[PDB]
């Protein structure tokens, strides 16, 4: 991937982490049933007024080594090319060629 795309991803994670608490608070206030309808409406308005990059749905998993956005394999944190290389070198504990 390009350095610009990697830095974009990093900035998005930073924004999500910065706004994590207030987003959860507003969502809880929205879900509150004892709260007033005006209170829940205001909470919804503030949630919609939060910056876009605060939303976790805009994060994309990228390979931890190269930044590739396809074939991620959450468990290892690496895309398929680097995963194949590392597994066949033997630096991934417990992973072996599978046959049955």
């Amino acid at each position: 991937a390009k350095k610009g795309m990697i830095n974009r991803e990093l900035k998005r994670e930073k924004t999500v982490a910065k706004y994590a608490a207030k987003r959860a608070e507003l969502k809880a206030t929205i879900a509150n049933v004892n709260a007033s309808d005006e209170e829940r409406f205001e909470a919804m308005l503030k949630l919609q007024a939060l910056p876009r990059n605060a939303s976790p749905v805009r994060l994309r998993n990228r390979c931890g080594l190269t930044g590739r956005p396809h074939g991620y394999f959450r468990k290892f944190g690496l895309s398929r090319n680097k995963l194949r290389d590392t597994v066949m070198q033997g630096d991934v504990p417990g992973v072996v060629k599978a046959s049955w």
Binding site: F41, M44, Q48, A49
Partner: protein, 82 residues
């Protein structure tokens, strides 16, 4: 469609503009990129220039279009035949 328990969605910047115009009575078009905003009853009688990707198409809001998204009146693809 959006859940009824959440209400219709309108962008705040667009809603403030239409509210200011209606509190006043300015007739100049309101220029917006918010194709996703829902047309509200307050919108009726106003001209909104909705972005369609390259231009801003003017739409005059009539009563029959309340409940539509603004983008349904600004097509984004060009086609005339083969």
């Amino acid at each position: 469609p959006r859940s009824l328990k959440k209400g219709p969605f309108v962008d705040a910047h667009l809603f403030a503009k239409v509210e200011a115009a209606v509190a006043s009575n300015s007739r100049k078009p309101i220029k917006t990129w918010s194709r996703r905003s829902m047309i509200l009853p307050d919108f009726v009688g106003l001209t909104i220039s909705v972005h369609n990707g390259r231009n801003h198409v003017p739409v005059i809001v009539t009563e029959h279009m309340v409940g539509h998204k603004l983008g349904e009146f600004a097509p984004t693809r060009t086609y005339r035949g083969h």
